[PDB]
Amino acid sequence: RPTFYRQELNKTIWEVPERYQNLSPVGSGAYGSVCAAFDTKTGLRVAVKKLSRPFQSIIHAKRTYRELRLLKHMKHENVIGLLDVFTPARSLEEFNDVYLVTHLMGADLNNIVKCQKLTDDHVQFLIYQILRGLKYIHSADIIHRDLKPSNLAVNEDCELKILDFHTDDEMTGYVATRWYRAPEIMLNWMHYNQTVDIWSVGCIMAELLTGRTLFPGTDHIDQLKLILRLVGTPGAELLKKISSESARNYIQSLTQMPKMNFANVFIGANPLAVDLLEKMLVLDSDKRITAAQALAHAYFAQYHDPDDEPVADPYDQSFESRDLLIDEWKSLTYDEVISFVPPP
């Protein structure tokens, strides 16, 4: 057990191992209760997240367990992983606070690229990295579900990590929280798949190429209309898969529209980029390109290396189907904290 010291930061007492020095709040609340620090043991600049007391309810206790399990699993260059996890508690009975330590990133994709068109070379490299991370995440049967520029963090050499794996209110109106969501998830059409994330990548890629939001809808329905104008209205085949009968019924009220010519939308773009976008932005999720398929697309010829695009170890999510008591989720979480082994 290391020696812990106390400091008052985000209106609360942080008790952390001596190895972490010069704690300073970051993100202005937008990432949770997170402080930047210097890890004297590793020489890394790190982010330390103190969970907002994590066992207040069953829902919150399970969410705490979920986040720790996910972060402990992720071991990939393009995905946020766990450098350390600790608690000042000396026993399960004393256990009430969890601190998570990760790499400190420089900026998110949003505040970097906002309103700006990138060069094709830069788009290739950024999207390649996202796809490389997604191949890894998907190989563990994990779906991100909320990919957008604000949960893509980059450093000075354009090296990228996926992080931050919502309420009805925060998804309402003219909001970036919804602009990158696949239509089947936005409108609860069906049980969705991993390629909900590929839709999101398509939206991000389009925006990097143009400097403009692809589907900046003023509400869910306005957004759907923007989407269907580009990709065309659904055919009978997809309509049958919309298991929601009310959703299915609303779609057939719309005047039919053919898919647009993407070369006339993304004017001047690399033809290979246009081709990839056409394969990502397919309405029927069964027919969307996968992360592994996309990595082998000719657009990434200068970066693709099938021997340097690893997959994840299997990830057991059986706990999701389980209904436990707070103290049980808490004990499971404690076991995961005390069993943590840091990376090389």
Ligand X SMILES: Nc1c(C(=O)c2cccc(OC[C@@H](O)CO)c2)cnn1-c1ccc(F)cc1
Token pair of 175 as six digits: 């909001």
Q: How far is the CB of 328 from ligand X (least distance, A)?
A: 22
Token pair of 229 as six digits: 């104008």
- On whether 315 is known to bind a ligand per the annotation, the reply is no
- What angle do helix axes 326-338 and 58-73 make, rounded to 10 degrees? 20
Per CB under 6 A, residues contacting ligand X are 26, 31, 34, 36, 47, 49, 71, 80, 100, 102-108, 153, 163
Dihedrals φ, ψ of 50, to 5°? -95, 115
Closer CB to ligand X, 92 or 107, in the complex: 107
Residue 123 DSSP SS3: helix
Q: How far is the CB of 3 from ligand X (least distance, A)?
A: 22
- On whether 26 is known to bind a ligand per the annotation, the reply is yes
Q: Are strands 44-50 and 4-8 parallel, antiparallel or unpaired?
A: unpaired
Q: How far is the CB of 121 from ligand X (least distance, A)?
A: 23
CB contact at 8 A, 117 and 210: yes
Closer CB to ligand X, 104 or 205, in the complex: 104
**Buried/exposed code over 275-297 (b: 16+ C-beta within 10 A; e: otherwise):** bbbbbbbbbebeebbbbbebbeb
Q: How far is the CB of 339 from ligand X (least distance, A)?
A: 17
Cα(109)–Cα(150) distance, integer angstroms:
6
- On whether 47 is known to bind a ligand per the annotation, the reply is no
Closer CB to ligand X, 100 or 203, in the complex: 100
Cα(36)–Cα(28) distance, integer angstroms:
12
Token pair of 275 as six digits: 């081709």
- On whether 33 is known to bind a ligand per the annotation, the reply is yes
- On whether 89 is known to bind a ligand per the annotation, the reply is no
Q: How far apart are the first and last CA of the chain?
A: 19
- On whether 211 is known to bind a ligand per the annotation, the reply is no
Q: How far is the CB of 37 from ligand X (least distance, A)?
A: 11
Cα distances (angstroms) measured from residue 132 to each of 89, 104, 122, 138, 315 = 38, 20, 15, 10, 18
What amino acid occupies position 175? Answer: V
Closer CB to ligand X, 163 or 182, in the complex: 163
- On whether 107 is known to bind a ligand per the annotation, the reply is no
Q: Is 164 a catalytic residue?
A: yes
Closer CB to ligand X, 108 or 184, in the complex: 108
42 exposed, middle or buried (CB, 10 Å; 0-12, 13-18, 19+)?
middle
Closer CB to ligand X, 29 or 310, in the complex: 29
Q: How far is the CB of 30 from ligand X (least distance, A)?
A: 8
Cα(157)–Cα(135) distance, integer angstroms:
22
Residue 21 DSSP SS3: strand
Catalytic residue among 164, 222, 275, 284: 164
Residues belonging to the active site = 164
Binding annotation:
26-34, 49
Annotated binding-site positions for ATP: 26-34, 49
